[PDB]
Amino acid sequence: CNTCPEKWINFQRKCYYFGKGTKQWVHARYACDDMEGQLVSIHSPEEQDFLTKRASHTGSWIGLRNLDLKGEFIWVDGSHVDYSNWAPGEPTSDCVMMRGSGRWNDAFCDRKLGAWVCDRLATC
């Protein structure tokens, strides 16, 4: 399965949308939902590398958040963290962003970032 909607990019069995324009995290979450995807989940180094190659230099929202501040970071699709790419010292805790390096930072959810990444399953 490697088919994606127009404007989305395939990697492996998924499709990705590199969104641009100011969003706080929840607004990015809904922006992805409006296009029938979700804020991206990341489950391998190879997926991460694909994303880093396209990462906004001024940071991007991804689909990880410290749910109900129950203290566990969980992906928006409900999957759990098995792969991680935290920047040194992170998480400091919120909502998670990807730096230009691809590394992750937990941040205030009301922070305004210029980019955000969505995913969905590729069709076959």
Ligand SMILES: [Ca+2]
């Ligand atoms: Ca942090």
